[PDB]
Structure 1
Amino acid sequence: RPVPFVLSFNNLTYNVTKTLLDNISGETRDGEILAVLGASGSGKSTLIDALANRIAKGSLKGTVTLNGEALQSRMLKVISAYVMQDDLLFPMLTVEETLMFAAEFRLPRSLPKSKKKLRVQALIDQLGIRNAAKTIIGDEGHRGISGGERRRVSIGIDIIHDPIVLFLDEPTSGLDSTSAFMVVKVLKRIAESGSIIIMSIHQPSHRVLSLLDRLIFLSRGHTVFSGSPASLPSFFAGFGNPIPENENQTEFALDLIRELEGSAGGTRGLVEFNKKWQEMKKQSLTLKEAISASISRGKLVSPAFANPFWIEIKTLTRRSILNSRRQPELLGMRLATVIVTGFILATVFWRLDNSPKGVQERLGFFAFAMSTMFYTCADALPVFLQERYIFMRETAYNAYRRSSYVLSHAIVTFPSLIFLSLAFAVTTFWAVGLEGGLMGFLFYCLIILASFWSGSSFVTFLSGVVPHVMLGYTIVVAILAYFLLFSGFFINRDRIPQYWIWFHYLSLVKYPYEAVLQNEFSDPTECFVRGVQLFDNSPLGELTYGMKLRLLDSVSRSIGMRISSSTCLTTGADVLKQQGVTQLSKWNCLLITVGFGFLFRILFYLCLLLGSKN
């Protein structure tokens, strides 16, 4: 005993000149699986984008009406669901967990978790995925569910709130003949409890034609057949091309059209025959209370967001913990890239002396060290697009906010970055022989952690801007190399030209590099030229030890300073003056590294706003 809903769309015209829809009529009751057949550019993903109100208002001339209140974009978020054309699921999540996260995101917080689990277990029985309810989804290399049980979990995510109107953009694409029948057979099970189901389909099997109660064929818009599948034999015989038996009728009715548009003819002879056939077959409670009559039976489980910003920030945290705990070779390869570089940098630069050449090796250690923190954060660019192609699916239903997505993904990566910062610091502080003691080691861990934080935020920012993972990881390798060229190591700040001293201050490597130099070269006790080391690698004065002091006493002719055999002519403060590291403190250079991390998480949030407009 369902509640009857009648989705009637009378005339549709969408022009982008180039028209895409032209006077498509339709009428679909509950219990029916109206199918929109067509071509690969016919615009059948545009027709159901116009019934789901997913195009601009005012650019769609005509009415899409339910039984009652005109069906504008206020009811088509509580009672509607639009299933897109992919299976964008997290692969380390089981089928019961994937539908329970969608239940915790979109079902209201007034429901208990025992009632949200009762919705998931009733949905797993409905989709026919009870045998794979505890099997993970799986990508190409993790041995999960099949390709046609990955579609009913994709369908099951969008119907977790139990809609009474269901749009699907090609739910049988990519599947074989025996599992595309299983998808429409559970859509028939959905559309017998009261749902209106409107789907696109390229080439249906003969088994899925007694499930579909209505068909619509499109030809660059321009509906050429619109009726029951049983009336499809007695439509083209009147047109001029009768169909033979022992042949799929929708197969013959589709390849006939793709040779009929011609060059001198056209589909116009077939368009005007469609309105001929619809004219001759006619000789044969409010909406808001009908929606509430569905909830009395129970046909609608579900404010803009069902959860507060602090509830959906612990659910997105629990997803990202579970998706990385079950995928541990991601922080096994990023961990053994900072340990391998940490072991290499510690043994090459092992216990650097206070020579003038051992000072330039500190500048070369700290430039290679602080660039590892930015290059190992670029390895996470594969699983940053994968988490935001699923985010763009779940933003259409308002499962969570964009603020709760950016904040909960800055949170889950941070215990990973604390472990990467201690692994790189205990390998390279005591082995390179860095200065500071223990309070210089704690700052060394803090500036590695801020460089992991500023580097993860930049690669996160460079994932709302790049489409591809190979274009993005070529661009981020090139840009971080320019951040290293402008860090002040290859060319100093007072030597960079004036048309280029703006990307020096925009360098992400500069402020970690300038903070470890004055963590290391800030000590009045350590010395790098002890009086005799003036004339050591000079172009003169290659003496044994004698008569160098007479050269040092000869310096007192011109200045008056009494230079002895050990007088400490170069401290660490003179190294920083040679390199130009004088403008900011090491704590101010730590704030800019933390501040550049917060900047690129805000700019990532602003690129999710403009990506929502697309």
Structure 2
Amino acid sequence: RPVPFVLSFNNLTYNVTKTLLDNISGETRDGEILAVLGASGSGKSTLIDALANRIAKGSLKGTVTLNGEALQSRMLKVISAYVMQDDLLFPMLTVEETLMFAAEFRLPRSLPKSKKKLRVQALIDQLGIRNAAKTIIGDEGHRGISGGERRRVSIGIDIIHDPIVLFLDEPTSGLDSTSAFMVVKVLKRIAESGSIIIMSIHQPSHRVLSLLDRLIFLSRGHTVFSGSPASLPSFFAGFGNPIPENENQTEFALDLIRELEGSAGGTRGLVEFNKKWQEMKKQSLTLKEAISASISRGKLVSPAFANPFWIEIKTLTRRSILNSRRQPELLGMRLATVIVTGFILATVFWRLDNSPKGVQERLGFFAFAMSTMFYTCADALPVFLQERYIFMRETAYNAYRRSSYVLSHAIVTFPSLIFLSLAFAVTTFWAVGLEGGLMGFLFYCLIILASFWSGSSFVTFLSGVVPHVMLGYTIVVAILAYFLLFSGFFINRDRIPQYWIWFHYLSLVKYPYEAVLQNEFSDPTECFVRGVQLFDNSPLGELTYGMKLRLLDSVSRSIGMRISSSTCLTTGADVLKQQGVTQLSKWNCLLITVGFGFLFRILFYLCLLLGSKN
């Protein structure tokens, strides 16, 4: 015996004015399924949105009462669930630990973990997915479970607290009819446990129509039929056109409503015929304690969040580790890109000399190397966009905080950024022949790591403002190119016009590039022009060694400074003065690179606030 529940909704009118819903009425009990149909663009997605209070409230007029009293929004977040229309699952998780991660986010922390696992096992048996309980979910290619068992996993995630009311936006969409029958046979099994099912459906078959107990047909937001499937031949016989034998009901009726959308009559005669057809059928408790009676029967397993701030971080981190450990070809293809790019740069710029052309080749190596770190952070854009679509599904249920999501996402990607930074520094420090020994190599690893951190924080921020991968990849490639034009390599800082100098200081390439230059040209003992090398790239100075030695001391008669054959005119400190790299220290350039990464994680948080209302 389940506790009886009755959901009644009357006079639902929704204006946006476009009047998308007009005088909808209905009634649903437990043990039954109310199916809503009618067209594409008919308003059935808007009808179950209005029944679930997921609207811009203040535009809906009408009463929605459960068991007699009312439905405010704070009761409907405890006893209801809304399964949205698609599957958005992590592919490398088995369906037992997919449902177990949902239990840790939503069921209370007062419940022991042994009883949480018992709820998952009882839900695996109630759904039709006992046969594949340790198979991974899979994707395009990893060979997991089928499309009809993925649908019962995404349904079973949303019913983890075992609600009393269950809203479903087209739960059989995209399935073949032998797996679209097992979905509705599971939804009939949930209804027999004491639940109220309200679902949208496109084209029900003859098999799933025996399981639906009530039907509502809509025609641009007007109800044109309301009743059992075994009243549909009796309904349209009174309208003037009965249903033939060996024809699918709710299919000829669905075609007749689309046929009656012409220009002479319209469906207004059918809206008026329905609202007096219901008038021929007129003849024929204790909601706060009825809910509490059902918790004693064993239904409602389940503060705004079930866990504190630190439990949600360690659960989100463990899920992201377990999902990327079982895909060890995403990190392997990122290691292989960085090593090949570093191997090419190390063999082109192999062992640069202390020539004036080797100084300009050092600046070109560093400008190209810093720009590859920011570009190779853009291949995380498809996986950064898979989540934030799963995240937007789970924050409708208050599964975890918005702070715990951004913090655990910044934590799990940081071990991969250390391996990428160490792989690029090992391939390029000793082969290009950079300066510093061991302390210069360690600063080289730190600023490569700070560039991977700020470049992935920038792509994380872009993955919250773009809809698809191609738009966000175009924006990365375009803005990185202008970060390189304004980095001080193509045109120096003291030569950039003053109406463009605001974008020089906003360049994400400028600060790591100015840090590796000051790490490189830091020794006072390095020398790039000695003695007779004053006359190399001038027309004066195509002469012999003995001829330029009297060219040197003939300059010493004028000034008084004696320039020997080895005087060390141009050092590394003079290279940085020629390029204009003088304003910030190399440790202050490292801190602006780390600080730019933190700013793009904060702007990513602020776009997840606005992305919930959008």
TM over 0.5: yes
Which residue is equivalent to 2:439? 439
Which residue is equivalent to 2:109? 109
Query: Which shows bigger deviation, 491-500 or 126-135?
Result: 491-500
- Are the structure 2 counterparts of residues 558 and 381 from structure 1 closer, same or farther at C-alpha, using a change threshold of 3 Å? farther
1:366-411 deviation per Cα after TM superposition (whole angstroms, max 9, x unaligned): 1111111111110100100001111110111111111111100000
Cα drift, residue 128 of structure 1? 1.0
Cα drift, residue 539 of structure 1? 2.9
Give the distance between the partners of 2:182 and 2:251, measured in 1 at CA.
20
Task: Give the match's secondary structure for 2:238.
Answer: helix
Give the distance between the partners of 1:288 and 1:449, measured in 2 at CA.
57
Runs of 5+ consecutive residues of structure 2 not aligned to the other structure? none
1:328-359 deviation per Cα after TM superposition (whole angstroms, max 9, x unaligned): 11111111111011111111111111111101
Give the distance between the partners of 1:477 and 1:233, measured in 2 at CA.
62
Whether the aligned pair in 1 keeps the contact of 2:6 and 2:68 (CA below 8 Å) is no
1:72-97 deviation per Cα after TM superposition (whole angstroms, max 9, x unaligned): 11011111100000001111111111
Whether the aligned pair in 1 keeps the contact of 2:37 and 2:215 (CA below 8 Å) is yes
1:297-345 deviation per Cα after TM superposition (whole angstroms, max 9, x unaligned): 0111111111111111111111111111111111111111110111111
Give the distance between the partners of 2:263 and 2:453, measured in 1 at CA.
60
Q: Over the residues paired in the alignment, what is the CA RMSD in angstroms?
A: 1.0
Which residue is equivalent to 1:456? 456
Query: Which shows bigger deviation, 407-416 or 541-550?
Result: 541-550
> Share of identical aligned residues, percent?
100
Whether the aligned pair in 1 keeps the contact of 2:48 and 2:198 (CA below 8 Å) is yes
Cα drift, residue 537 of structure 1? 2.2
Query: Which shows bigger deviation, 546-555 or 252-261?
Result: 546-555
Task: Give the match's secondary structure for 1:22.
Answer: strand
Task: Give the match's secondary structure for 2:333.
Answer: coil
Cα drift, residue 544 of structure 1? 2.1
Give the distance between the partners of 1:471 and 1:578, measured in 2 at CA.
39
Cα drift, residue 538 of structure 1? 2.2
Task: Give the match's secondary structure for 1:9.
Answer: strand
Cα drift, residue 560 of structure 1? 3.2
Task: Give the match's secondary structure for 1:197.
Answer: strand
Whether the aligned pair in 1 keeps the contact of 2:170 and 2:202 (CA below 8 Å) is yes
Which residue is equivalent to 1:352? 352
Give the distance between the partners of 1:559 and 1:370, measured in 2 at CA.
43
Task: Give the match's secondary structure for 1:215.
Answer: strand
Cα drift, residue 532 of structure 1? 2.2
Query: Which shows bigger deviation, 591-600 or 277-286?
Result: 277-286
Task: Give the match's secondary structure for 1:45.
Answer: helix
Which residue is equivalent to 1:329? 329
Give the distance between the partners of 2:291 and 2:121, measured in 1 at CA.
24
Give the distance between the partners of 2:68 and 2:453, measured in 1 at CA.
54
1:283-306 deviation per Cα after TM superposition (whole angstroms, max 9, x unaligned): 114211111111100111111111
Task: Give the match's secondary structure for 2:27.
Answer: strand
Cα drift, residue 48 of structure 1? 0.2
Cα drift, residue 141 of structure 1? 0.8
Which residue is equivalent to 1:596? 596
Task: Give the match's secondary structure for 1:156.
Answer: helix
Task: Give the match's secondary structure for 1:175.
Answer: coil
1:547-588 deviation per Cα after TM superposition (whole angstroms, max 9, x unaligned): 212222233355432221111111111111111111100110
Give the distance between the partners of 1:190 and 1:561, measured in 2 at CA.
96
Cα drift, residue 456 of structure 1? 0.6
- Are the structure 2 counterparts of residues 557 and 218 from structure 1 closer, same or farther at C-alpha, using a change threshold of 3 Å? farther
Give the distance between the partners of 2:396 and 2:278, measured in 1 at CA.
36
Cα drift, residue 170 of structure 1? 0.3
Give the TM-score of the pair, scaled to structure 1: 0.99
Higher helix share: 2
Task: Give the match's secondary structure for 1:310.
Answer: helix
Query: Which shows bigger deviation, 557-566 or 161-170?
Result: 557-566
Give the TM-score of the pair, scaled to structure 2: 0.99
1:146-200 deviation per Cα after TM superposition (whole angstroms, max 9, x unaligned): 0111100010110011111000000000000101110000000110111111000
Give the distance between the partners of 1:205 and 1:194, measured in 2 at CA.
25
Give the distance between the partners of 2:352 and 2:479, measured in 1 at CA.
30
Query: Which shows bigger deviation, 41-50 or 60-69?
Result: 60-69
Task: Give the match's secondary structure for 1:573.
Answer: helix
Cα drift, residue 494 of structure 1? 1.1
Give the distance between the partners of 1:357 and 1:202, measured in 2 at CA.
70
Give the distance between the partners of 2:51 and 2:303, measured in 1 at CA.
23
Which residue is equivalent to 1:255? 255
1:182-222 deviation per Cα after TM superposition (whole angstroms, max 9, x unaligned): 00000001101111110000111111112111111011100
Task: Give the match's secondary structure for 1:384.
Answer: helix
Give the distance between the partners of 2:106 and 2:378, measured in 1 at CA.
33
1:112-261 matches, within 5 Å, as 112-261=112-261
How many residues end up aligned between the 2 structures? 614
Task: Give the match's secondary structure for 2:332.
Answer: coil
Give the distance between the partners of 2:431 and 2:576, measured in 1 at CA.
23
Runs of 5+ consecutive residues of structure 1 not aligned to the other structure? none
Give the distance between the partners of 1:55 and 1:590, measured in 2 at CA.
47
1:404-446 deviation per Cα after TM superposition (whole angstroms, max 9, x unaligned): 1110000000000011111111111111111111111111111
